[PDB]
Design an enzyme around this catalytic site. Structure first.
Site, PDB file in Angstrom:
ATOM      1  N   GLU B 150       0.768  -1.239   0.000  1.00 53.59           N
ATOM      2  CA  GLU B 150       0.000   0.000   0.000  1.00 53.59           C
ATOM      3  C   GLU B 150       0.808   1.303   0.000  1.00 53.59           C
ATOM      4  OE1 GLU B 150      -2.787   0.382   3.286  1.00 53.59           O
ATOM      5  OE2 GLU B 150      -4.127   1.685   2.142  1.00 53.59           O
ATOM      6  N   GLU B 244     -13.240   1.913   2.323  1.00 59.28           N
ATOM      7  CA  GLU B 244     -12.666   1.905   3.670  1.00 59.28           C
ATOM      8  C   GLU B 244     -13.057   3.213   4.354  1.00 59.28           C
ATOM      9  OE1 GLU B 244      -8.444   2.686   3.707  1.00 59.28           O
ATOM     10  OE2 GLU B 244      -8.074   1.035   5.086  1.00 59.28           O
TER      11      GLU B 244
END
Lengths: 289, 289, 289, 289
Positions: B150, B244
């Site tokens: 990420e 998210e």
């Protein structure tokens, strides 16, 4: 509407003196050069006078930022800290007036860094911040100085993250010379709409900072400049627009502003000036002024 | 292209287990539910089997995120920490395989928090991270698991801040099952362009996270969803798209994600579900799937 | 705020009747179905009674558009044409009433096509236009009907191309039941900003048309829907939001609307319905209602 | 990448000569001045050599546009019109070469205006256009001239409305010196995405026109300039970028370009020049080159 730039754009350390930048920034075409208040408290009254004369001779206006510390700030639970913060502001404000500076901005209601590994007291810091600002407002006002409260992103402040929150805080302070301050970098993270945030600030918008989302000079990126320009005009903003670009890694600025990668494209001083000069023209054309 | 949601959207504490959410999320219409790997490390083999069967019966797929600690990570200068990190990953990966999970994402190359009040070794952390990740890739590959690295914003990581840096890291690792992972919240801060960042990741994009600039559900804000959907299709992305959202203050989540104000509009659970349901339909319609 | 769709979305010919669409559109979930007022002039009283009953049984509202021809336009310099125009409107308004329709929109102040290969008298058309509309306002008002003047792009009208021009015209008309009507397709060409145009319209916005820049259903493209929703909410808009998509080539609609290529992705009827349903959900989630 | 401006920006009649503008535009800082090629057929070889010298002396390049008529074009079903188009093109190309012009652009595959009240034959006009362009390509190539086919919006052309359609046409022509030409004003109406259209054109992009959605100079509006600049760089575009603004009402230009309202802000010549000079700087900074 006037345009300026924060001189630290050209440095790596906050300790670099701004004196030589007065003439340089003026020569690049800016109406204003924004400086850091702490530097000001170290100059002799004779030096301040020389600096004020340099600005006058170069036809440039000075604006200043103030960054309270953990030991001297208006929001701390510690009464001693709050007393030292109030004393710190009065001293800085007096010196600021010696440079014919009338706009002071920044997280005046708080401080930097802020240990987020330790619990945070939002309601308390808000209430104490309001009171602390209210308490230095008249002193600033006697000097013809407006205090502009900067709205910051969640990673840098936990009290005012939104233009709406900034406006509520300012209304609570209830002083004619305390204004809201917005910054495109911070708005990019927290706000629902740039235009809406600016209109929300409305008559209370006293200072404005610009930069792309990753802090390059205005015009290099995807910021909705046209929408921003329209909103500033909608509220008849005639204040200052200071570009605050941070594109160089290294030094205290590099680590404090978290500039981990170079965003200047390996620019030499001449290229840095060129980007600044082009961003200035871009800003005047798209934003106004 | 499949759509999911990180279950902690409904919680206030990271310690809240995900088991009860398998069915809830499946019934809201999601193809996937993303869970925290550290909970997988606590469940007993019998409980994991139950969860696995539950996912199967409800027709939903599971994906997971790993959050290494400063004590167990792959980028530490400390040899013992790197070894502890490797053992942690192998143990975690083996458990993740028990739930039939094939995608693991997060800041696998380093850890969180990361104290920025101390000096940082960017070059060294990057290099140790490359060797560290290369060192666990085959173990992950033998279990049929892709490791997705990420890319994060500057306030959360100092090594990989851009899709381009992420791609360079992944190529340096040189493993077929190690991919780049992008997140709209983080891209919103660091990237010059959303479309360009996604096109840059190209064939190496293995996981994707979504949310508005301030983290509410997709479709509530100004994110360039049309441009993002177009780029995802451009690169024939057929991986997972996990929203998210973090819109609730309080608890360890509220302080860790720095949600200083409510962004749910005072929503009760029923309203939280409705926002997720509408964001899901919006994502399917604008992005794909 | 209520959502509808112009039924010709599914056809190739203007001649296609709307009767069968009342139920079809209602079951797709729309609040309103927009219809062509000229079709109303062709049904017998018994047929109008049936249609009116059908709409109520299906819980859906009808709204309609008027498209004056060169033979019956209120802006004509020919006194006889203006008289014919007035009669056309009275007859049409009386028929519309039989269907319990309370909103009529379109280029009521002019006509279509309009030959731009011949001289244009903007000032005159404007003046006669104001006169004519003022001239039928009360007749419409007694039937409980609002006349909404549509602002069009330069290729379709030469008098009202901007929200501001639309507002000035309506103000000159000076009638409570005469409103301004905006259309995203037209605004995309002529307006400086979608938000400012909607805000300029303000209290006078009486009807609204939506579609992407090339007329696909809302949500398929790059229109600033978040900005548009925020603006509609800013002015407390509670009127109708009619999607007016034209994605089929061939037939009179294709040549009249200049749809020279297929924009439906070769959609069968099921896909056309699905796109409409998805655009409706998208519109409710992003715009409101 | 070079920047230019269509000189008619300063006039109201297409008949105004461009002679005096060569030096005016050069002194404004432009690399290129674009003119209408048919004017070139009116000058004697001597007057042409004078124009060519003026251009060289002022260090500026000339580019030209061609607008075929109903009686002389390459797509007409009438063979006599097609022969007239070929003869007119070959004559004009020979003359254009006398001014060292290497780029000719416009609706070369069609003509203007095009009466849409009459039926249109897309497939036929397409086929004949491909044949006609293929037919004069070698002639232009022998003179070092690239023919750039302009993609227009639906109100002005029915054959090529999108970059993809333009690309298909150019590929069918199969000549190295025949390129696609895009215009932001036209793309704004028809394209799904500005960036995707430019990438689609790719290596075939040979000329580029800029203007805001309502034709004001670049930088005055909401056009996604940053995205456009990025795309032009993605494809390594090294051609010309010509701003084609029309902000003045009146005259043949006003009616042909359908400029029904002033968009110059009542600008006198100095203000028109300033807007041009500012848009030029804006374009070099945001678009590149």
């Amino acid at each position: 509407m006037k345009h300026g730039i924060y001189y630290s754009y050209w440095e790596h350390e906050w300790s670099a003196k701004f004196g030589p930048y007065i003439e340089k920034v003026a020569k690049l075409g800016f109406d204003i050069i924004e400086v850091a208040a702490h530097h000001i408290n170290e100059y002799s009254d004779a030096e301040l006078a020389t600096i004020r004369k340099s600005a006058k001779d170069n036809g440039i206006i000075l604006t200043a930022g103030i960054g309270p510390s953990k030991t001297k700030n208006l929001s701390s639970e510690d009464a001693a800290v709050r007393a030292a913060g109030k004393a710190f502001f009065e001293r800085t404000l007096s010196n600021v007036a010696k440079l014919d500076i009338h706009t002071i901005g920044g997280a005046l209601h708080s401080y930097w860094p802020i240990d987020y590994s330790q619990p945070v007291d939002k309601a308390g810091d808000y209430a104490r911040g309001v009171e602390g600002i209210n308490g230095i407002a008249d002193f600033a006002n006697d000097l013809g100085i407006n205090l502009c409260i900067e709205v910051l992103n969640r990673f840098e402040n936990h009290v005012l993250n939104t233009a709406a929150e900034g406006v509520a805080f300012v209304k609570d302070v209830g002083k004619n010379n305390v204004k809201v301050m917005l910054d495109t970098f911070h708005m990019n993270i927290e706000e629902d709409s740039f235009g809406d945030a600016i209109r929300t600030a409305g008559p209370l918008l006293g200072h404005f900072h610009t930069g792309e989302s990753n802090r390059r000079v205005p015009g290099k990126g995807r910021m909705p400049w046209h929408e921003i320009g329209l909103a500033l005009r909608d509220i008849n903003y005639t204040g200052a627009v200071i570009m605050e670009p941070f594109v160089k890694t290294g030094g205290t600025i590099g680590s404090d502003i978290k500039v981990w990668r170079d965003l200047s494209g390996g620019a030499d001083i001449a290229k840095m000036d060129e980007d600044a000069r082009n961003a200035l023209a871009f800003s005047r054309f798209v934003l106004g002024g």
